[PDB]
Structures are given as structure tokens and as C-alpha cells.
Amino acid sequence: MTEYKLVVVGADGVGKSALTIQLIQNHFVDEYDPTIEDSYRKQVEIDGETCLLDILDTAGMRDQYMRTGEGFLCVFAINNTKSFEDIHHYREQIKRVKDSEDVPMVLVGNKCDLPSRTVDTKQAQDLARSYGIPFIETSAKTRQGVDDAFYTLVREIRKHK
Template structure:
């Protein structure tokens, strides 16, 4: 007997041109969009397995805080210091808006542009510590580096937050993220 899928909503939030939509499109459709078109809100869906259990459906809502979000991907560009500095303001706004904490991870996008780097990985790690041990990582939506890991990490954080961490083994089931 399988357990029902859980629906999850993940918000990708960050400054303009950091790659929010590119990250989502790369994850869902496995391609990179070269042209920049400002996005107000997009929704993407993808079914995946988490820990070999069930079908997980991702729906990534970018650039807008919505009621019912289960986890947040705070994203900046490693080539844009200002976008990194905005992460604190974005996090503060989320915490001020919510009545309870929600899982978050911090992601430095555009790691393929390492020669144009303005934010070191050490600074990213320090910010994660400052936020109480929030997981951090770098990725590249363009080269598809660590893209799946970003989404696996936020699901892991959501599961831990809700008491369904890796310690708790389930025979079947999964979660649907939308």
C-alpha cells in the first residue's frame, strides 16, 4: 500500500537577472534559455523521485512570496555582489511575512562564469552560518551543474523540517511539490 503524495511549493527568490527562471527551466525542461525576459511569476512542474520513494512533483514559483510555500531557494549570481547582498534583505522579508520558519537554502548561480566572480564561496559559506546553518551551494543553470542537487537539497530540508528526515525510513510513498 503506497502513501499518498505530498504536495510541495518551492519559491525561487532573488534579484533580477540572477537566473531564477533559468534554474527552473533547466531543472524541468533540461535546457538553458539564452535570452533574458523579465519574469514576474512563472510556474513549472516536474515529477521526480526523492529517496527512491514515490513521484515528487515540483512547481517552482519565482520572484513572489505566496501563501503555502514549503521551502525557499534564495538565489544570487556569483558575478554580482549586489545580488548576494540582497539575500539578507530577501530572507528578512520572508521571515517578517511568515508566522513560522520555513526551510531555506542559499544558491550562488552562474558558477560557469568563475573568471567574473565577485562573491567567493567562503562568503557564501559564512552567510549560511550567519543564517543558522542554512545549506549553501553553487550551481550553473547554463551548464546544468548542481541543478538537480539544488532541488534535492530543498526537498531534504523540507522533509527534515516536517519530521520526515532520512532517519525515518518509509517503504513507499513520496511527496508532490507544486
């Protein structure tokens, strides 16, 4: 069984904890302590491979998962322009950690269940294209794109190493 070290990053309130918990416990938490940072393990089969996902949910230890973490989930909320503006910082932070523009990464638009997006799907694709990374729209309330995001990241790690 292979271990995949997965780091979820992004501005506070985007649903980092919600996306993590939905994957692990299969339920939507409406209020998880914004300061709680932890790793959460789950056995998953992705493409006939049994995987141990080691998922650091950054909140603000980190150094290890940033340094030794294999794939990064870059999450903004579609109803939160600032969190999408902040995405540059996190991409930069990762590049700087691993001294490379070739780090497995997925850009994540979360809260796609909410109406009246301020961040267009095209804006987000435009960014991801510019990074050479996938873009996935997710909802931790609906489970929309939730496996897709984590699994695409795993496949990125595999397509990298």
C-alpha cells in the first residue's frame, strides 16, 4: 500500500476543512475550528491501486508536509474573490518549497453549490492553464468534485514520479 502525502492550502474559510472531512467521514461539517491543523489518513482505491492518503489540512508541523508532501490542493471559494486573488501566494509558496514549477497541484473552486459566483469558471481555468495544472469545481456540502479533486491530485503525483 502506497502513501500519498497530500497538502490542502488556501485562504481561511474556503472549505479546506470541509473538503477534507467530507472525504474522510463522508459528511459536511458546517463549523470546524478555523485554527485546527492536522493530518487525516484514508484507505482509497484509485485506478485499481489501494492508496493511503495522508492529508494535511493547513490552518496555521506544516514544514514537513510542505517539504515532504507530494501533491498540493490549491483551494479558493467561487464566492470569494479575495481567496482567488490569494492563490498566487500559495502557488509561489509551494514552488519556493520544492524549488520547481513542476509540483503536482490542483486548483480547487469550492462552494460551487452556492449561486452568484464572483469567480467565473473561466477565470479559474485561465489561471490553472497558466500554471499548467488542473482546475476542478467542488462542493463539500454536496460531495461535488470532491473525490475528483483528491484523485486527480494522486494521478498528478503518479504522472510526476
